Chains A and B, each alone.
Chain A
Amino acid sequence: TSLPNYLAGNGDLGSWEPTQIFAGEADIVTEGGAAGADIEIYQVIAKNAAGAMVPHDPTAT
């Protein structure tokens, strides 16, 4: 932080990609319900017996 560099070197600032999400022209419907576990971005969600938002996982009896 404190000292600047006088020497000669190199580096990459990084890379960027687009993440496209939509694929068609349907109407969009949204809602906010309270979650029951941690959910990542764009993860498929289910609803448990308590009405929360558990992220989707089949084979659950």
Chain B
Amino acid sequence: APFVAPNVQGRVIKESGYNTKTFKPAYVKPKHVIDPNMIIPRQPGEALGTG
């Protein structure tokens, strides 16, 4: 606090305010196509020879 000789009035002290922040989410969208080519060859848990 400021020192002030007791004859004079005194002194006004300033102040301050504040700020704001805002954000927006990004957007993610993957996909897959499913051909017959990704279906027809053999998967590993299938017996050899036949299917």
Cβ of A34 under 8 Å from chain B: no
Size class of the A contact interface (CB-based, 8 Å): under 10
Q: By the criterion CB–CB under 8 Å, are A18 and B38 in contact?
A: yes
Q: By the criterion CB–CB under 8 Å, are A22 and B48 in contact?
A: no
Cβ of A23 under 8 Å from chain B: yes
Q: By the criterion CB–CB under 8 Å, are A20 and B41 in contact?
A: no
Cβ of B37 under 8 Å from chain A: yes
Contacts from B to A (Cβ < 8 Å): 33, 35, 37-38, 41-42, 48
Tell me what chain B mostly uses at the interface: helix, strand, loop, or mixed.
Answer: loop
Q: By the criterion CB–CB under 8 Å, are A16 and B48 in contact?
A: no
Q: By the criterion CB–CB under 8 Å, are A20 and B48 in contact?
A: no
Q: By the criterion CB–CB under 8 Å, are A18 and B37 in contact?
A: yes
Return chain B residues, CB-CB under 8 Å to A22.
Answer: 33, 35
Return chain A residues, CB-CB under 8 Å to B42.
Answer: 16
Give the nearest-CB partner of B33 in chain A. Answer: A22
Q: Which of A19, A20, A23 has the most CB of B within 10 A?
A: A20
